[PDB]
Design a protein around this ligand. Structure first.
Ligand SMILES: CC1(C)CC[C@H](Nc2ncc(C(F)(F)F)c(-c3c[nH]c4c(P(C)(C)=O)c(C#N)ccc34)n2)CN1
Ligand code: NA
Ligand code: NA
Lengths: 292, 258
């Protein structure tokens, strides 16, 4: 192509990503070679990612620059991002991330999510390595391959969704319907991860994941989540742990932060705060702009 | 009432203008006709029933087909191949468990090969520039149904029925936006079953008065009246099942009496 492969970034099931240079314009890009190798032609994940990204023009959402499609070859050309949240947290593991930057990053991320949700898109794979950071201090949602356009109201969608550590309880307990609330859970976990520099709920299995959540937020019952005891994968034998104090779970956080974080981590998806409502939360009355 | 319901509706109203096919496209097609399109869509309804696909998938396929035929000339011998690929793409976009290509070939009866169907997928994607997330009559109907104070399962199925009938006849239904057809459908269903009319709450949400819906209503009334006579019957057949409360068997009203 007009592209020079600069560096290999990683191989997935979804496919191969290279850092590349436009040899004519100099523009640095990330090239996603889609794993076609294809009994069924173009993968659904590729079709969803392009069709939904072409519709999502926002400062806090990755820019799709171009699609190069032949037979047995499909490349996606994205803006190249210098760093990601996973990497920035590691290089901050001791120092810490300053609270005002945390706040700014969370504000931005909510701005991107609100935009998605208001354009009827569920992300469904939020996690630190999908949250990319550029030199100008912008953080953007990326990797929309597991996303989906959703209906008003919703119907049943795919069950195997969200990485374990960031998976909302309604999905772990196998509810028929899920919606925008599962993305908010994911962000709550990440907010908490920026503060403490450790994964909030690192399960190694579905049950272990529930238990990590319950140990921290309390075991849910009919009181805080009506209908919960009726659910497919709920068991009456679940240990009955008490909700921990948030002052202990996330020490660095002020009153406003705790209040927001607990609203993002409500068990009942109906009580759980929307991206849009969260932007109006007092926690952000003094938020600052993206800066390099 | 879910979060962002008014935002999504506003977005859908923007996107339905941009996602519209060229109104007069069949005139400029040398080899195919409204009647041939009808046979295709009707066949696509049967494909949906056999493979237990969502209503939405069928409405998207049709939107893809019409946008494609707006840009490309197709011979009648190849029209079914465009529909197969449109149905494959719609399924990939919307279904949890889309049929595999081998099964799309089976449902055509080996009229085409796995090779042709995959390649036509390629070409449809190019022609649509990968813009597959189109608003449908379906998406507008489900939006409108939330504004029924007493939810009526029979009004809902019938509204869906009428919306599906509009997919068959390019003349006159390409003239109208999905949001207006849906408006027409909902009112006609409501009126038929309960005698009620286009609610004051939907007037506010859409900005469409019963009066502004009259053109589409006069058409849709007619389509409903003559539905037992129509060549294509897969939709009337589908909506006999218990799943849709046998709404296809209801007698329509003689007088709309707006
Ligand atoms: C470790 C770093 C800091 C080095 C640079 C990388 N910069 C970047 N800029 C744009 C994109 C985008 F979004 F444009 F592609 C991507 C990207 C997105 N998904 C990726 C993957 P996945 C999650 C598909 O596996 C893998 C793997 N392996 C590797 C890269 C990406 N990365 C970010 N992380
Ligand atoms: Na013609
Ligand atoms: Na609504």
């Amino acid at each position: 192509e007009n592209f020079q492969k600069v560096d290999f970034l990683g191989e997935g099931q979804f496919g191969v990503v290279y850092k590349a240079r436009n040899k004519l314009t100099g523009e640095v890009v990330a090239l996603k070679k889609i794993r076609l190798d294809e009994t069924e032609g173009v993968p659904s994940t590729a079709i969803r990612e392009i069709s939904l990204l072409k519709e999502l023009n926002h400062p806090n959402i990755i820019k799709l620059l171009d699609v190069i499609h032949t037979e047995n070859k499909l490349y996606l050309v994205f803006e190249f991002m210098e760093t990601d949240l996973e990497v920035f947290m590691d290089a901050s593991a001791l120092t810490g991330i300053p609270l005002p930057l945390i706040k700014s990053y969370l504000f931005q991320l909510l701005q991107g999510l609100a935009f998605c949700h208001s354009h009827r898109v569920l992300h469904r794979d939020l996690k630190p390595n999908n949250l990319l950071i550029n030199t100008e201090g912008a953080i953007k949602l990326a990797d929309f391959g597991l996303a989906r356009a959703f209906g008003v109201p919703v119907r049943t969608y795919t069950h195997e969704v969200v990485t374990l550590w960031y998976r909302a309880p309604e999905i772990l307990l196998g509810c028929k319907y899920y919606s925008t609330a599962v993305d908010i859970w994911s962000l709550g976990c990440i907010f908490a991860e920026m503060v403490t520099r450790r994964a909030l709920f690192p399960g190694d299995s579905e049950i272990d994941q529930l238990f990590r959540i319950f140990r921290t937020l309390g075991t849910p019952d009919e009181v805080v989540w009506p209908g919960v005891t009726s659910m497919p994968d709920y068991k009456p034998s679940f240990p009955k742990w008490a909700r921990q104090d948030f002052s202990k779970v996330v020490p660095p956080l002020d009153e406003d932060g705790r209040s927001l974080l607990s609203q993002m981590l409500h068990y009942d998806p109906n009580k759980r705060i929307s991206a849009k409502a969260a932007l109006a939360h007092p926690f952000f009355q003094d938020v600052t702009k993206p800066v390099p | 009432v879910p979060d962002y319901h008014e935002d999504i509706h506003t977005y859908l109203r923007e996107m339905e203008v941009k996602c519209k096919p060229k109104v007069g496209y069949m005139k400029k097609q040398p080899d195919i006709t409204n009647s041939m399109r009808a046979i295709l869509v009707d066949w696509l309804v049967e494909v949906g029933e056999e493979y237990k696909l969502q209503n939405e998938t069928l409405h998207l396929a049709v939107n893809y087909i019409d946008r494609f035929l707006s840009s490309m000339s197709v011979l009648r011998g190849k029209l079914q191949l465009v529909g197969t690929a449109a149905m494959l793409l719609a399924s990939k976009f919307e279904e949890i468990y889309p049929p595999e290509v081998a099964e799309f070939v089976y449902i055509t009866d080996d009229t085409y090969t796995k090779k042709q169907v995959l390649r036509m997928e390629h070409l449809v994607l190019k022609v649509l520039t990968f813009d597959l997330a189109a608003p449908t009559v379906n998406q507008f109907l489900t939006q409108y149904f939330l504004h029924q104070q007493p939810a009526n399962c029979k009004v809902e199925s019938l509204a869906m029925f009428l919306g599906e009938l509009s997919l068959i006849d390019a003349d006159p239904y390409l003239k109208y936006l999905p949001s207006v057809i849906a408006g027409a459908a909902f009112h006609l269903a409501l009126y038929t079953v309960t005698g009620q009319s286009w609610p004051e709450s939907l007037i506010r949400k859409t900005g469409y008065t019963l009066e502004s819906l009259k053109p589409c209503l006069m058409d849709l009334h007619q389509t409903y009246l003559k539905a037992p006579q129509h060549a294509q019957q897969s939709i009337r057949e589908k909506y006999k099942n218990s799943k849709y409360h046998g709404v296809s068997l209801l007698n329509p009203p003689e007088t709309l009496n707006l």
